[PDB]
């Protein structure tokens, strides 16, 4: 089947990175398999498991144990860790109503260039996971609150995020604080929106 095809790629990509670097890769198959299941049973709760949304966790999972290698972190704990951070995105989604295409992906957008982020300054990994899910989940809670139905506007405030960390990237600043501000301005702008 194609879960079947797209889980085997994924342990496949998590062995050969173990492989690379001397880590211990039946743990690494382990928490490949572990992880396909984790997202796949999040998306289907979610009522997201399209296979096209199913790519883009296993992307997201990919390339953050790809660059753990990179990197000189844990291959089975940055599988891991990304696969949580999809789940929290799903369990966001879930709870707001969220089935946008494009939000989802932003989202996992969003946890990848933390992570990255994070993995290029010695950082962990999932203090890293735990700031990019947090700010999709306040950014939907608010749109739900505030009864804002337009994917346009919530693409726009996931772009601000990635923007805001971008900048913090650049400029040397805190990741996790950029997406903490970043968030809170849209929750305030929409809860003004409800008020008004």
Not at 91 to 120: D, H, M, P, W, Y
């Amino acid at each position: 089947s194609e879960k079947e095809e797209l889980r085997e790629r994924l342990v496949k990509i998590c062995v050969e990175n173990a492989k690379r670097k001397g880590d211990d890769t039946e743990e690494a198959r382990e928490a490949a398999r572990e992880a396909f299941e984790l997202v796949r049973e999040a998306a289907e709760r979610a009522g997201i498991d399209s296979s096209e949304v199913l790519e883009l966790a296993i992307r997201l999972i990919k390339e953050c144990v790809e660059n753990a290698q990179r990197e000189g972190y844990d291959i089975s704990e940055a599988c891991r860790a990304a696969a949580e951070a999809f789940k929290r995105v799903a369990e966001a989604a879930k709870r707001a109503g969220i089935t946008s295409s494009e939000v989802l992906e932003l989202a996992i957008r969003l946890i990848k260039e933390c992570v990255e982020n994070a993995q290029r300054e010695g950082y962990d990994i999932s203090e890293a996971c735990r700031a990019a899910a947090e700010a999709f989940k306040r950014v939907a809670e608010a749109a739900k609150r505030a009864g804002i139905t337009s994917s346009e506007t919530l693409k726009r405030a996931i772009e601000e995020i990635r923007k805001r960390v971008e900048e913090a990237q650049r400029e040397g600043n805190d990741i996790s604080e950029a997406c903490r501000q970043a968030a809170e301005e849209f929750r305030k702008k929409a809860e003004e929106l409800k008020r008004r």
